[PDB]
Write an enzyme that holds these catalytic residues in place. Structure first.
Site, PDB file in Angstrom:
ATOM      1  CG  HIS A 118      -1.922  -1.102   1.202  1.00 40.15           C
ATOM      2  ND1 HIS A 118      -2.867  -1.326   2.184  1.00 40.15           N
ATOM      3  CD2 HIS A 118      -2.091  -2.092   0.289  1.00 40.15           C
ATOM      4  CE1 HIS A 118      -3.574  -2.402   1.877  1.00 40.15           C
ATOM      5  NE2 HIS A 118      -3.122  -2.876   0.733  1.00 40.15           N
ATOM      6  CE1 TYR A 122      -2.594   4.833  -0.256  1.00 39.70           C
ATOM      7  CE2 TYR A 122      -1.003   4.220   1.423  1.00 39.70           C
ATOM      8  CZ  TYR A 122      -2.294   4.200   0.932  1.00 39.70           C
ATOM      9  OH  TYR A 122      -3.192   3.452   1.673  1.00 39.70           O
ATOM     10  CG  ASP A 237      -4.946  -5.782  -0.052  1.00 41.66           C
ATOM     11  OD1 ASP A 237      -5.329  -6.875  -0.534  1.00 41.66           O
ATOM     12  OD2 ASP A 237      -4.011  -5.118  -0.553  1.00 41.66           O
ATOM     13  CG  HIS A 241      -5.512  -5.430   6.400  1.00 46.78           C
ATOM     14  ND1 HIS A 241      -4.800  -4.361   5.889  1.00 46.78           N
ATOM     15  CD2 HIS A 241      -5.083  -6.532   5.724  1.00 46.78           C
ATOM     16  CE1 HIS A 241      -3.979  -4.807   4.938  1.00 46.78           C
ATOM     17  NE2 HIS A 241      -4.140  -6.119   4.822  1.00 46.78           N
TER      18      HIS A 241
END
Ligand SMILES: [Fe+3]
Ligand SMILES: [Fe+3]
Ligand SMILES: [Fe+3]
Ligand SMILES: [Fe+3]
Ligand SMILES: [Hg+2]
Ligand SMILES: [Hg+2]
Ligand SMILES: [Hg+2]
Ligand SMILES: [Hg+2]
Ligand SMILES: [Hg+2]
Ligand SMILES: [Hg+2]
Ligand SMILES: [Hg+2]
Ligand SMILES: [Hg+2]
Ligand SMILES: [Hg+2]
Ligand SMILES: [Hg+2]
Ligand SMILES: [Hg+2]
EC number: 1.17.4.1
Lengths: 339, 339
Positions: A118, A122, A237, A241
């Protein structure tokens, strides 16, 4: 204290999730809680690479945005970057030293690894929309409104880590260090873990979802579509989590894993409720900074406060807490297209 | 004194690899050392799912091997499982809390994650070749010869973790803890980290390669092909892992990173040498147990000992150490087929 390979033969199906014997053999043929093995499998099946996503038109869309909209977009992205910078390292540094079943140990390492992807995504977006990425990255550390919104996240993790170190080094008891009394209580450490896990649940299940609404409001206008594709993969995702922390939390409070954790959860009910309300309040407050120069179609301070309340109620009910807000239908049904 | 999100706006290009300010923002648009970014990218490019590998014929092959060959195969597999159980968790619990540049932080978390995939692959093989995997997994913990071969690995990581906790809690100085005088020296902690890296280099660059040679001796016989495919995938990852520690070590030696680390590498070089000599001897000592029920054509104590000396010299030369063994050509050139 802590050991990377406990040499005592133990039945891993009978250890508690946390505070038992450190995991020795990593095996995946059996589990005390199969949800963690299912989550590992699903997360591996969702493996993706940020650079495989075309973000070539996002720079021009971003440039064409009215200044206040550039502000909304980049501020939201900076907050997402901050949260996952913390989530890439923290589950590993804070939870691994306390885990006593293999499936949960590997789930935490898999979860943390997916957070690093992730973070990489970004960077892929930022590099493809601004001339100099450094301005964006440095603002993340010092931005006053961002830190105000995320206030307390690093502190929960940090306090748990420090208390874990004292417990591993000195054990329970009343100790002295350089003339000061230092009290170490396993009960207090279990309470710190419980509240950190609840905070992580609020982080992934509420804070990130408010951020997803912002990102997807642009996608609805057919803008910042490269970013949208990336956030879609990230949110897929994130659902795994938050499922993981929901199961950890519900197993801890039910008493089926550790009776003492069940007593703790009950004793901590009020505190936990108010912390969730504080997280929701921080997300709402972020609206004044976000819409300081005006709002956008499909997104303004009021619709966001409504979404914050909607999602908070859902998440709190999922972990057995009373609902702090008036019940309502999803204020932004269109977001389901993206989640 | 560790924090999951350091609040000081620091220039990450100027921090040392280890012991500087903990990493705050995870960014990948720049690096102090691009080799760690390249390693992350390569490891992600190699992503593989163990369960997809067809091991359906390995059970037939294994059950039909003579007993002593079953012993050789399973003893080797159990050692691989032990080492990667340790490697799955240890880089994250021991190295991650000490890293001060983002590319190295993420490399360590990616490296550790890839080790949990190796562990998952050993479970896939084990559960598909024996009827009670538990006997195999439990023996890994209790087997005297397996633990003797690995002696010093877990204890070194454990000592580093303990010293790190004292440093993060108390800082440098001479302290009084429960009436005991405890010295916390950052130079001593740097020496411990440095030698831990050398030990991890020996683990992945020598110990695992001796085990790969044993596994491939079966592949050369056209047997255990599922296992062979998996070990080939594992070895491809291991080459990246040892490349990472070779670069960490050689960059520290160069003086281009923390100057104190370059002093330490020179001051500690006899200890670097000694730990490689000791690991090589442990790998040789294992042969008596491995071949206790008989050897195989092309795989016996003599051949194993020659290979240990051959690979140890290659790996020690790669990090600047003098060679302890007589020079020789590869005793098992057939291994190149598989690597
Ligand atoms: Fe994330
Ligand atoms: Fe997440
Ligand atoms: Fe491995
Ligand atoms: Fe490795
Ligand atoms: Hg936590
Ligand atoms: Hg936390
Ligand atoms: Hg938003
Ligand atoms: Hg929003
Ligand atoms: Hg609670
Ligand atoms: Hg809470
Ligand atoms: Hg509201
Ligand atoms: Hg080590
Ligand atoms: Hg061998
Ligand atoms: Hg050295
Ligand atoms: Hg030899």
């Amino acid at each position: 204290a802590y050991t990377t390979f406990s040499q005592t033969k133990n039945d891993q199906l009978k250890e508690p999730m946390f505070f038992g014997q450190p995991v020795n053999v990593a095996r995946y043929d059996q589990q005390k809680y199969d949800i963690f093995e299912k989550l590992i499998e699903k997360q591996l099946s969702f493996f993706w690479r940020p650079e495989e996503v075309d973000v070539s038109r996002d720079r021009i869309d971003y440039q064409a945005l009215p200044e206040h909209e550039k502000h909304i977009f980049i501020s939201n992205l900076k907050y997402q970057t901050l949260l996952d910078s913390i989530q890439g390292r923290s589950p590993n540094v804070a939870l691994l030293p306390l885990i006593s079943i293999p499936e949960l140990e590997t789930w935490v390492e898999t979860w943390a690894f997916s957070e690093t992807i992730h973070s990489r995504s970004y960077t892929h977006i930022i590099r493809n929309i601004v001339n100099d990425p450094s301005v964006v990255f440095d603002d993340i550390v010092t931005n006053e409104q961002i830190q105000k919104r995320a206030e307390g996240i690093s502190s929960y993790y940090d306090e748990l880590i420090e208390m874990t170190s004292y417990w591993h080094l000195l054990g329970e008891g009343t100790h002295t260090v350089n003339g000061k009394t230092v009290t170490v209580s396993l009960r207090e450490l279990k309470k710190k873990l419980y509240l950190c896990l609840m905070s992580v649940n609020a982080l992934e299940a509420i804070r990130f979802y408010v951020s997803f609404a912002c990102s997807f409001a642009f996608a609805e206008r057919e803008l910042m579509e490269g970013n949208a594709k990336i956030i879609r993969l990230i949110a897929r995702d994130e659902a795994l989590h938050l499922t993981g922390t929901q199961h950890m939390l519900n197993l801890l409070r039910s008493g089926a894993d550790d009776p003492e954790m069940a007593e703790i959860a009950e004793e901590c009910k009020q505190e936990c409720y108010d912390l969730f309300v504080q997280a929701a309040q921080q997300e709402k407050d972020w609206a004044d900074y976000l819409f300081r120069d005006g709002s956008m179609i499909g997104l303004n301070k009021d619709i966001l406060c409504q979404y914050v309340e909607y999602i908070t109620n859902i998440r709190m009910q999922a972990v057995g807490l009373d609902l702090p807000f008036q019940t309502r239908s999803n204020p932004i049904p269109w977001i389901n297209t993206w989640l």
